[PDB]
Design a protein around this nucleic acid. Sequence first.
RNA 1: UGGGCACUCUAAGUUGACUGCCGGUGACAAACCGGAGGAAGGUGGGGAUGACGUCAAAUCAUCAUGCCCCUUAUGAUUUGGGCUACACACGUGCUACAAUGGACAAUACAAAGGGCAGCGAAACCGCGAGGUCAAGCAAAUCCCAUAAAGUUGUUCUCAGUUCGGAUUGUAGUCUGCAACUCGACUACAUGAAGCUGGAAUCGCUAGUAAUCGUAGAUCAGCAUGCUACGGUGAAUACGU
Lengths: 116, 82, 127, 155, 51, 60, 26, 97
Amino acid sequence: RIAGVDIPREKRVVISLTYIYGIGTSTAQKILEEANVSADTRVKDLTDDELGRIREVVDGYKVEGDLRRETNLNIKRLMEISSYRGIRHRRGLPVRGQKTKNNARTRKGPVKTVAN
Amino acid sequence: ARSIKKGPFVDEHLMKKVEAQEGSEKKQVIKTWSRRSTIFPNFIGHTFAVYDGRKHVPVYVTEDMVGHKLGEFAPTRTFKGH
Amino acid sequence: VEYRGTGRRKNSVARVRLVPGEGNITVNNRDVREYLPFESLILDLNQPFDVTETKGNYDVLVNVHGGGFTGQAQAIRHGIARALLEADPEYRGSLKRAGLLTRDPRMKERKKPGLKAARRSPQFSKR
Amino acid sequence: PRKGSVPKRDVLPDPIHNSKLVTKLINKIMLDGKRGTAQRILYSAFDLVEQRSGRDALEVFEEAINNIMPVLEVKARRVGGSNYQVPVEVRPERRTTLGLRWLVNYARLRGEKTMEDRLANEILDAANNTGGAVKKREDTHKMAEANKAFAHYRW
Amino acid sequence: KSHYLVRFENVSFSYKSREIFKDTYFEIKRNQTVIIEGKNGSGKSTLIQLI
Amino acid sequence: AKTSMVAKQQKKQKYAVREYTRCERCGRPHSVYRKFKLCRICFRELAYKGQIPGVRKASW
Amino acid sequence: PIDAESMKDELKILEQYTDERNKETD
Amino acid sequence: IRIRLKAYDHRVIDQSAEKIVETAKRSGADVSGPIPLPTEKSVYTIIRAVHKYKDSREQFEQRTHKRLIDIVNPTPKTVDALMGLNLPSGVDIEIKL
RNA sequence: UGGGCACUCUAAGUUGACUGCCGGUGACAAACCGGAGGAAGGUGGGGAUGACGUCAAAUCAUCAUGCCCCUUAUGAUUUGGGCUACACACGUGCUACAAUGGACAAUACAAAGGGCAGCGAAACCGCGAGGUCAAGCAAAUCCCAUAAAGUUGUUCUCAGUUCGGAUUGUAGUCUGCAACUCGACUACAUGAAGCUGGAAUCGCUAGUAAUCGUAGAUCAGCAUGCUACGGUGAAUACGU
Ligand SMILES: Nc1ncnc2c1ncn2[C@@H]1O[C@H](COP(=O)(O)OP(=O)(O)OP(=O)(O)O)[C@@H](O)[C@H]1O
Ligand SMILES: [Zn+2]
């Protein structure tokens, strides 16, 4: 309603303004400086006085599809020039200098206990 | 990395032998060690032979390389599988 | 006509100054109930005042240094009581039976090497 | 220990209720070394309970630690193929250590929100012989009954 | 993978003249087995309806 | 090894990121103080004879 | 309640030992 | 007129200080009795083992003691003893005039 | 702060603690339990201090060296790579799974140590890491230095959540000839497994365990590690 995302109801407006991919809590409580809502009211209690005036800066940024494959291309260029990174994407490992002999279990799945 | 107020770093001889055939007929591969120098737009079209430790492995500089380092595109370790 | 006494406790040093007056205690430009955050410490640093049975006769007037709130609320009580065997030193039979003229030597302990603390060893696995 | 015995440590009364059964209940409540946030929970549950029930705050708490005082209990030996649990009688100062932790760890096991009132709903239910803490001088009181047979193996 | 399944908060109910439950508490935690008792007309099959 | 590597450390090297200390009694890179220029073996082996001023043990 | 007066009752049965039976012929 | 005293041992930092302050009390001038200042202990723990045994360490240290001396009435003949070099080879004095 | 050496602090000297004393169980004779002057009472509390030997334990790589080897090399100088590799199994830690918590505001109280081509204030600029100017201090004076827990408040109200902060894309700041393989920090977005742990297993008897913060040596740069330091501070020891 404020985007393709429908931020929930029964929530402070600056809380549910975190529900959108692309805006956390630093863009969620000075998004209320373009429009002017107290940020402490529930989303169940405001009219469309600001309900579009919060729908105007919500598009001033790049949000939820405007951003997702935005940063699937930037993690695609690193596969197509073939830099260092990306072969650590197009393998499945950690790409900065995170070290891989001991704790690398977010890039790699769960364990594969093998034979000793 | 380096900064805004410092420039990019290119190793002072990877430019002279590149801005020495500024206006020349062909491109022969350039023999390098400086894996550490950044890539300018100037290199666009070049294929350098960088050093990955034992062999000069060649890559040809294109226009999506134009913010990278010379040695991001030359492996140092070898790992086929366990 | 004020009495005198220093008492210490645990790296706090507090200089206390018994006067003739009514129940009230000022510490470092402040009322000690702004100084002290628990009602636990303001009950026993006037332990001297209920052992001798002179509950309200003095204004207190402390000067403190070092430590934290327990050791300062407790270096004091060794001032109130080492300024009252100085007024009537013949009070001294009974303010010393409640165990109130001990300095209380229990300080904080060296750290030892190859131990993670004073007395805390590292985790032992044998295989 | 082998060489003998020692003392305990003797704590001076509360400011307010004027017992040492409420200073030794903060030392069960305190944790990690923080007597700040244990004296909210213990003076905000004498007046979160003092509303609910119209008698004093300290006679509905002190009857809430005397249904919990286990009078018997089991201790162990071996045999050489069995290991029998003997029932022994409990001293007059160990029933006061256990009643005061059978009341404070049966409070983190409760489905209220803030431990002002877990400790508050547990001093008012335990005052009526019921609930958590005060079945456990009944867990612990059949085991000294089932084992009423092996009493002669005592010390 | 949690602690509590259902809960009551001073719940009451009534069948137009019959006052089945006054304010009561009820709880079922993860991996438990509850056995409700009573007699005929106590309110067992109407407690299961409140859930 | 030594007696080749120490005579390339008493020699001013190019970029001053490149002055590793390396003890001036024996030659050891490895645990070397600045106030003494004496590694952990030689501080204990010299402060025992008594030829390092003002030093004793500590027993606090 | 279990009525813990067993404290008064498991004190007579405490004294029939395993060796007290060995003695005291009938 | 402000002077400072140093030494690793205290035995020659009072054998010096309160030895020559009455080299000022010789003539007409009086000096403040020597004021001790906060002394320092440095400490260095090292490894006893020449090889693989942390957890067995050894500590040493080295102190420096400090002493204050200041006089209140210098004459033309109370600083002509400035070069009365008789201090026993360890002390280090600080004169700032 | 003018003036003062009282108070307390600094540190030299010198007091002090010995079963001296005093009851009564021991006549093996030592000792043991209790008591009263005391700040502390029974080797006060903690340290250094490690016998004869055991393990042909560890170290020829910090150093020295008997015997045997190499000597246009098994020696010597550079650039770049490597010790940072990742189906995996183990040892030590750290961060949490929240309501005795998150968040964001007012507000107190320690010590122990480092500091010259090195600490680096106040002012200004920056959402922030930090930048430009720059006083003072070879330092009980000045700087690092806010202690964070704590306390008074508004608030959120049991949900993988405002919990938790992995993993990534972005845009930056510093040091350095240079952070590409491979440094710390900060902004915005991303929002991973984790609801208190199977078999078994570990530390600790008092200002100790637990939590909380500060500080040093190595060091251009980089710590969750090691050696220190203090604030708040329990629970239990019947016995053998
Ligand atoms: N629709 C209704 N209107 C009015 N009263 C009702 C209604 N349904 C049930 N009751 C009353 O509620 C009471 C309890 O009903 P409930 O269904 O709980 O019985 P129960 O406890 O399940 O009995 P059983 O255990 O034998 O099944 C009964 O006494 C009945 O009279
Ligand atoms: Zn050496």
